Structure 1
């Protein structure tokens, strides 16, 4: 099985681009990261920052996770992100996503040793 840290990287990191420049970015990335393999993952966010900068969020502002857990951290600065969400007309295996680029603070859940991001909670 994939570790939790590795799964976060695979689902959320896209350091190769500064931001989504096409409306088709989500359709391509969701497929390339195998997020449409068995089904269409409904929502997913990609972060366009270095891995080191995202990992550093685990030493930033400690906040509560939506679930009530307290191992969430909010980035001090905003980051370039792309939200990917299935449109009303999406049906596996013909997954279709709307791409929305923005600059926001990210909130992630951290765990382990080393203490790294294991889940993407939200953006603000």
Structure 2
């Protein structure tokens, strides 16, 4: 099956653009990355950085994840992110999202060898 690392890339990475450039970004990306296939995923974050820069977070500041696990890491730098959140008019299969662009630190959970991000925990 798809690996956890590959799933993180599909769900969360967008190195092809520097920022969301229109209100339609989330609607397009949530659909194209197959996040709306079985249900409307309610929230999701995309990171507009190189993969290497995001993977490097696993070597940065160790912090507790929101659920208490201790394999989370916070980026030293802020990154360009886009938050996608379901709107009140969303109704499967026509899932609809509000796009919000921001510069925040990211918190990811890391696993494996090579030790790589497998879950997006928060932006702060």
Shared fold per TM-score greater than 0.5: yes
Distance 2:52 2:84 in 1: 23
Which 4+ stretches in 1 moved above 4 angstroms?
A: none
Aligned position for 1:108: 108
Distance 1:74 1:43 in 2: 20
TM-score, normalized by length of structure 2?
Answer: 0.99
In the TM superposition, what is the alpha-carbon distance from 1:120 to its structure 2 partner? Answer: 0.1
1:71-113: CA deviation from partner (whole Å, max 9, x where unpaired): 0000000000000010011110010000000000000000000
SS at match of 1:31: helix
1:36-58: CA deviation from partner (whole Å, max 9, x where unpaired): 11111110000000000000000
SS at match of 1:66: coil
RMSD over aligned CA atoms reads 0.4
Distance 1:88 1:110 in 2: 33
Gaps of 5+ in 1: none
Count of matched residue positions in the alignment of Structure 1 and Structure 2: 124
In the TM superposition, what is the alpha-carbon distance from 1:68 to its structure 2 partner? Answer: 0.3
